[PDB]
Amino acid sequence: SNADDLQMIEMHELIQEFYYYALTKTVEGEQALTYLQERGFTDALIKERGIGFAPDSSHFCHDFLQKKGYDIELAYEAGLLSRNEENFSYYDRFRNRIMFPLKNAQGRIVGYSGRTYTGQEPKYLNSPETPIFQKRKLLYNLDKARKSIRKLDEIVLLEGFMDVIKSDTAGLKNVVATMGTQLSDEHITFIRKLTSNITLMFDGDFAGSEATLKTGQHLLQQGLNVFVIQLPMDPDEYIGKYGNDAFTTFVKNDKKSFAHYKVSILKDEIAHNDLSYERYLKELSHDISLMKSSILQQKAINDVAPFFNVSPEQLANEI
């Protein structure tokens, strides 16, 4: 019920204050606090994002919500507590982890990502699927970035919420990310309403490349204008190495239409494998045909044609 959903949100938003105090003031939170600070997290950023610490007692959250008068089973259903099958008793889901609040589209805290700082696994522990937290719907940082997204008529999708945090502080405001899932049809529906331009900036590794191609391809087919930013590397590493301005400048300078990025990745295979040459020529020709922007479509043709050693006209004809 809506009444219950609201109680679940209340629980999250109240415990947040406790998590925040635990991190910034208490003895047990000192290690986690120093960890964060050594990694560029200033006291301002920590406060701004309400980052906190979950003690390791395993009843810290339980006892707090119990003292407040919340139904323990409801707290379990809100994904803040876990349950012992054998005992049937309840305990904290999140223990000895740095707590990043997960806010919904309206800015209400509906879940948490708990990050280890002692090399435990999973490295990141998220809230489970609940009535108020659904990974296929929530986009980290969306409520904060909505304004800049509409203003710039562009949304930038990163690989993880951590990248979003780093980028956001650096000066890149129209950024969001899923909670470790593939962009869903619901996500895409939401995004389409804000803008028709979506830029991908995933990890600069093979895995990230494959994600870029798979996500970008679907977005293109869904009628969106897709762009790609390719780091030499992750935002965190780039920002530290060259600073914020250098980062935001690199992002603004290099931004390729999906089709141009795609063929550049397939460059070598196309030039050494005639079977692939033919297949990718047809693919890119189909890809370019999906582009709604006449202007960018034409530029894509000019940019892609050289990769197949054909003229823009011959590629245009093929399309």
From Swiss-Prot:
Names of the cofactor(s): Zn(2+); Mg(2+)
Keyword Transferase attached: yes
Amino-acid positions noted as binding Mg(2+) 1 in the UniProt annotation, renumbered to this chain: 159, 203
Residue stretches making up the Toprim domain: 153-232
Keyword Translocase: no
Keywords: DNA replication, DNA-binding, DNA-directed RNA polymerase, Magnesium, Metal-binding, Nucleotidyltransferase, Primosome, Transcription, Transferase, Zinc, Zinc-finger
Subunit-level organization: Monomer. Interacts with DnaB.
Function description: RNA polymerase that catalyzes the synthesis of short RNA molecules used as primers for DNA polymerase during DNA replication.
UniProt comment concerning the protein's domains: Contains an N-terminal zinc-binding domain, a central core domain that contains the primase activity, and a C-terminal DnaB-binding domain.
Identification of the protein by name: DNA primase
Organism: Staphylococcus aureus
Gene from which the chain derives: dnaG
